[PDB]
Amino acid sequence: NFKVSQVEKLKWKIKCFENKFLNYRLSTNETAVAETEYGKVKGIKRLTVYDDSYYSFEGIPYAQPPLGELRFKAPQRPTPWDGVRDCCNNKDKSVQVDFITGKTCGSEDCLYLSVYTNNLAPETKRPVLVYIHGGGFVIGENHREYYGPDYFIKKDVVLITIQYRLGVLGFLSLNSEELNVPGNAGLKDQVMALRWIKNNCANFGGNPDNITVFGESAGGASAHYMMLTEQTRGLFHRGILMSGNAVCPWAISQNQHRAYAIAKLNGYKGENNDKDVLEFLMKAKAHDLIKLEDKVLTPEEHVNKVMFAFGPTVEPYQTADCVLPKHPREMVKTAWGNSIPTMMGNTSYEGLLFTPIVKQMPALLKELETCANFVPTELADSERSSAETLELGAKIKKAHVTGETPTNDNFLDLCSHFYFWFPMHRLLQIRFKHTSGTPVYLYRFDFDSEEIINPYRIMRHGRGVKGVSHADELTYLFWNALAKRLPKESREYKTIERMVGIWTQFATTGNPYSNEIDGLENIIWDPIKKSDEVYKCLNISDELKIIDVPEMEKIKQWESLYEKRKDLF
Template structure:
């Protein structure tokens, strides 16, 4: 994926970035503070948030040894202890990745660090801990203030931990040879290691090790889901918030019938046989930038037409089990009896996730213009035969395009279709699984539908300023201050949405119930004693008895409604046998 941003918007983003960096320097004090960890002491610094709260920041704390040299592609190992006070006052380098705007490789392989933010190091009693896992399709992302500054969440009394993990081939390369010990999912194993660190060390920062909530968006949401499924994380956390990404999303499972590692080796100059040891030896010597530059090109155009995969290196079923195995079998099977079925979950997505497809259409317009009867859009894990794929494809074309021919003029219809294919149907299947296999643990469904002309940052970057709607990742602007944001007046609808979203997440972290008093933006006309003016103002967990799942719809006002996507989701459900659906 790459973004072709209008020159005017590029200049605006650059100007905002300079302002952001300048403001960050003003908010950072010279007051230092020292905290303990099990590995040694760390030095942090006192900050002020843009809305006035003071907090302590510890950035760049190592939770594993640098995954370089002999540790490249391998599962992470514990960091060494240190005796001197370690300076943790600046964010460390992002993981190696391709910058999708500048088309350059950035970051470092030495990337396994986390950031801790806390209002009080020694509160009267430990406070809830929130652990954030960033998204980016398992190809990009970073634990940085540029994207995830803690200002909004530091308005509340919690500890926030932002973790890092390896990406792309460096984080998800897989080899079949057991003796090499590279079965894949090193990036997910980084997350497991970080969660172990949080469990063991959060008390030193005022956090409650018995009240940890993991939350993430997109690939971070899918990662959070995987953390609920794997036995590696049993009892490491207690609640989850899953945003716009689940383990069942088609982009969150890499097809295993193609040897992506061998293709990568060939693309970087390897001319030998298909031999794991030789391939591994070659790839260990390659520059990280060489591996990442070619990875996007080893997917053929035909495979893109068939929607085989969006990325060639991501979560995968591991070819053999080890003591660090995270995904021993399909996530569908893991969901039925995982330990995470015993803990509360908030899950949801944005109302027009598929606006994220605009850059793909700009880069490869033939993927839209040559859709034909949509037979390649049938879910692969439904295991339909050719005739069934064609029949289902025709249903999809009728449902999303009607009698219009797919073309650039139908890009919004195309985007709507992929809202379901890439995001909402995975969420739907997860809801069905939770309703049947986790009936005792509450599962709350939300739908983020807040459409701001100037503050839905991802839509502006992805689609420009003429398109409206709530795009994939637009909700991040309301959880984290970032380099594209600005300080808002407290009376604005955008600020009230920030307060609302942060309060819901924190209330859920505190109690396992995300309900807060719902106040509309038009407070003058708000009926007394209710959040929405309707009797359905209480947000209840889903139930297997629900004919249609109810969701909390977060727009300019907030209401509990029937999920608007339900009818089209039933169409996607219909192509699965029940045992393949959930």
């Protein structure tokens, strides 16, 4: 359980205070009004520490605030307004537990997006990049102390960052059709945001016919869901799936029974009926429900590796706004998004995100004696004790346990594959088997530095830790409160320009290669082919190089877990 040190709690609060005052010194006196389909909005011109400038519109509503009876329901469109709406400050984040301070924060009034561009009257209609933040569908925000546009606005693009409901408030699911809480409200928020963007980005200089959706972690799962569902057919034109996709095990769960589990932890003393449970939850104070989300999972769900109590789900009945009518495994076979250019990737040591989990409870290391608990659920029996499942675990232990005694690095390496690399492989192959989908480009983020970091490093106790962890690449695409100005010839600065260059180039043309990017001149970067038995990727380190994916040999061993049930792979 991610407990951040008290020494680090003080440091973070100091940095955020300094950051508030930097932001004062970066804001100009210049403002701008733009149109939206609901009314005018006013934005403010801001500087970056590199002395570029950009127009900044935050807190643009794309839905009605989901208060009162609208709680747990699919989003509804907002009420139009006259006059100019002030969008010079951020709005609240979705209700959550702050991953640093451990206190509940945020507000139910969180359905907002931010729009940023260096020029409101450009000489072209620019590619629109839409970022969906990660955080397990339970934490995160679009605040600029985490997701600053300062690097992207160096290019002639439009960056849009969105919020969506998190946790139980975004993902309650009830079987009773009469209650109209089918689930995935948080993904339906993203759908309504994407429709707003198609319909309004032109008012900020963007190209409605050239929109790129990208996200990291649960945000990449979200971006993939947005490429899978029929609700969004045709709404955008490129996807970038960073360190996560919709067939990741942690990104979906049948959580319809957990509504009663969370209500009873909050004091509900009624029977287990959907109508009675919902009535209680509609009256509950929002921060009470979200603080207890931690303890909703059962033991049996924990050992089965269910990460979150509430999150995306297969909806139990059809509604007009339904996002997931079938399992994502099946939706991939006819997804409209298979026909748009796609880039995916991971970092070179994804599993580093779990370092305090295995430091806190070293009893976790015993799980690598048999590896029974990492056998995927569809291949395992109920109690994970049948000899076939132990034979599968030995295959997992062969792949990751280096010596005769399991170590912490072994555990983390296994996490990289179980949570990220293997579901990527499975996604790519099920596309080839069932679709005419367009070839996909692979990158591998492998630039390690601590000169500049991002707040997710605090969460994983990454201070002093070598290796390129899950979410370390965000440092090189987004400004954040821990960042600083860097010398132009430094390795960190060149990595920023390379990452922003590749992401922007892919958004522009659907092809992430350009010889005009420093380090790519004599390089040829091909997408993946059906017949490829070993994946090639762009390994982004101090040098840019096309290499066989180093994870490929371990990926092939995870696939061998399915050779007696190839229909489930």
